[PDB]
Symmetry: C3
């Protein structure tokens, strides 16, 4: 899986260990080994949510499977929770796009997973 967060929160407010915690929590949440989890945190972004420049985040989670109605609610509770607690971002200022990728459409190690 691959989780990306873009945020206007400054780099110095991202706690040490944040990418490790995300790796670990997403491994548990998706059922995928942590070896397969990629994480990407982009701070200091020029962005707005509802025309306000208060802290916000735009995120995506791509996974081959493990995407759906109930699961995405669960990911959103987990991920909004972490962004609120570690980055101090209110949950109603977070968007997360979920993508169920077909294995044939995911390249890795000179090939694809199909």
């Amino acid at each position: 899986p691959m989780f990306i967060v873009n945020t206007n929160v400054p780099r110095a407010s991202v706690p040490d260990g944040f990418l490790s915690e995300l790796t670990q929590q997403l491994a548990q949440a998706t059922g995928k080994p942590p070896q397969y989890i990629a994480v990407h945190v982009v701070p200091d972004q020029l962005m707005a949510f509802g025309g306000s420049s208060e802290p916000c985040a735009l995120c995506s989670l791509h996974s081959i499977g493990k995407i759906g109605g109930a699961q995405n609610r669960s990911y959103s509770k987990l991920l909004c929770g972490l962004l609120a607690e570690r980055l101090r971002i209110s949950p109603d200022r977070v968007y997360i796009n979920y993508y169920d990728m077909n294995a044939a459409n995911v390249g890795w190690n000179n090939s694809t997973f199909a």
Copy 2:
């Protein structure tokens, strides 16, 4: 909705009011309250368009509904106009990926919209 602009135009050339202008214009274009519009502008990018490093933009608009053949042609005109006037980017150097997102694949406020 979620609107993102990646561009090689330097940060100093992005006007301070561009995010708010995009928010308002997108709110009218989509018929959605401004509070739910998120906008993200990423300047100083290392990019090329047609092999040229003249100013260009790679963009995306995510939305639950309000996406489709005719609406997207309308959006391209609105967004090329804004990018051309505010960022001085030629409209034939602008790409916009449109995404019609399922409500169950959009997380917000600890849940999804489904």
Copy 3:
């Protein structure tokens, strides 16, 4: 088409002719005209792959057609090889998401490609 690379490799390790090389190689690989190929490289990113902060990349290729099982494996070999030779990133630490976009969902110069 549109090709993006996000990587933790430093800005200084990106060869000067890298954008041009990606443009030329993707034209050959997809058969699309080079005038319509956009490339985007984002270095110095805070990211982890498999819990590790060794060099990695998260990439995407959007195209109207020319996306499929066999082609994606060919693209992966081409692009992973380019990232290994030019950015010294191991292919086993690269993900590439492929997107077959509908022509009506790709905006360009005040319209779409539909």
